[PDB]
Amino acid sequence: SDPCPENSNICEVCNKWGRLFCCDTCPRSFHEHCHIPSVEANKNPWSCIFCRIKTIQERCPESQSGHQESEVLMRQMLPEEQLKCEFLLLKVYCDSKSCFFASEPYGPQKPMWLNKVKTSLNEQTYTRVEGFVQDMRLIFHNHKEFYREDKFTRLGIQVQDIFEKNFRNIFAIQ
């Protein structure tokens, strides 16, 4: 039978089936380590990061001018900033092409990958928003060479675009 019939049969992030956790405030479902932060198995009720971002947004409607990028980057990683960074990281994973940047590469003076950023963010290693944003941009900085197969070049271009669009939407940057 379906134990959670009003929640998705498929992970919001990776669009695959399996062992899923089911949000109590929206129909979304997630693998334990696809959600960011990791799902707390014993939290009841549990609201996913989409619902928690929506709550923050509804209680602090944005200004018409928005924010400067440098103002945002200099922010201490207070709980709202941490959550927005987690949601921004998650929106990158939400693209299937993210898997090519998720794992440790097998060149650059500072390799970087999404699972390393996930770990650093979960351990709250970043003390400012800029620490997170800098590591995310390093991933794309490290891939600035034409690939023999153009599709691999276009891949980083598109994931970088996904990051930058979400970064400005989520933090409401000018």
């Binding site: 379906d2 134990p3 959670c4 929640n7 049969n9 498929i10 695959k16 089936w17 399996g18 062992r19 899923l20 956790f21 089911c22 109590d24 479902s29 799902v39 707390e40 198995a41 014993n42 939290k43 009841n44 549990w46």
Partner: peptide, 8 residues
Amino acid sequence: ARTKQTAR
């Protein structure tokens, strides 16, 4: 958190 097992 509620959970379920799904399958393709």
